[model samples]
Target: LGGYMLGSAMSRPLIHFGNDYEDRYYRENMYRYPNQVYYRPVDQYSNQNNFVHDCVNITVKQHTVTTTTKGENFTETDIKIMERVVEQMCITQYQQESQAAYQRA
Candidate 1:
């Protein structure tokens, strides 16, 4: 094995579903740093294919915003920034809990 152990502890899958990172980060974070950080969602239920984070969001998708294999990466274009409070809460809670487990593991 020629890979690095890239964390302070063992990292395992915590919140597998319903913690849509792509939509939440876009709507929550207002800064427009194009390449510094981005969000993505994985289809863990029906599709669990790629581990690569390079997939980008596609405009044709109808569900919540997520990264696609086509590499259509982008930042939220909401010039009139507004927060979807409930969605933010759900994502925030899921991320916090999942990360806690990841670090603990």
Candidate 2:
């Protein structure tokens, strides 16, 4: 049960971005209940937190660069760093889930 809870916690950021249901939940209840409690930030519903500001900055940069440049170069190092982040958080937890499914088979 503890492991399951941990996995759920690890899965949250990924699901928040990837899953439509989770995205909707974020929109509808981002300031209340489990959303507010679990992903707590001060006055999170205002969308002016550090995390949201960083996200917006990235989006603006991407747009501005894409507009000026015909092509954007994504460095291998950038991808590797992203992969490391995902492996530690999402991929590792997902692998554990897959192994559990296999054991049930």
Candidate 3:
């Protein structure tokens, strides 16, 4: 082969379809960057197709990152800025989440 091993990562799927989701991040001293990082959902349930880490509170550490034929990519930055972006995205999703409430009498 004429390619390099590049490096390794440790990200999870950002599962949707639920509220009160807690974040579980990591940074095991594996400081080797990947070509890119994607924070997709870690779910394989019925909504398995819901691929997008733009959900809520997904504070993934290190290079752990996603899924989907979803044409999205983000690199050239470190966790210091990345996590901050995550915080904002979470608020966006939460606002949407609140709007789409399962209200009833």
Candidate 4:
């Protein structure tokens, strides 16, 4: 069983973001598995190309990502544009998901 889901959590102590699960949405916390993966600049594990997260019990390579090419460097103007784009993306996903849930209900 997954436990109760209708309480006000009055008696049990409240858990913070990382204290339990359920903190990944809108915050994107990465629970690095093997190698602690958060360590600095190590030799990449060979043959592993990419890594993604769907939450819980998975690990992949974490390698250097600082390499840049022409126009790869972000300038002040680039930051402003990127920030606006990222902000819109977040809002778009939030609203879309909210609307979908509301519609289904």
Candidate number achieving the greatest TM-score relative to the actual structure: 4
TM-score, one value per model: 0.17, 0.22, 0.26, 0.28
Backbone clashes in model 3, listed as residue pairs: 10-64, 11-64, 13-41, 13-42, 14-40, 14-41, 14-42
lDDT by candidate, in order shown = 0.26, 0.31, 0.27, 0.22
Predict model 4's lDDT versus the native. 0.22
Q: Tens digits of per-residue lDDT for model 3 on 6-101?
A: 111223222221332212221211122212233332322233123214321133332343311233233333342344333333333234223322
- Root-mean-square deviation of Cα positions for candidate 3 versus the true structure, in angstroms: 14.9
Best by lDDT: 2
| Candidates 1 and 4 compared by lDDT, better number | 1
Q: How would you encode candidate 1's per-residue C-alpha lDDT over 28-105 as one tens digit per residue?
A: 332221112112332221221121122111111211234334444332433111122212322332453245434543
**What tens digits encode model 2's per-residue C-alpha lDDT throughout 26-60?**
34322221111111122223222343234223332
Q: Which stretches of candidate 1 lie over 4 Å from their true place?
A: 1-83, 100-105
For model 1, how many clashes?
Answer: 0
> How far off is model 2, as Cα RMSD?
16.1
* Candidate 3 Cα outliers beyond 4 Å, as residue runs: 1-59, 65-77, 100-105
Model 3 residue 33 CA deviation in Å: 11
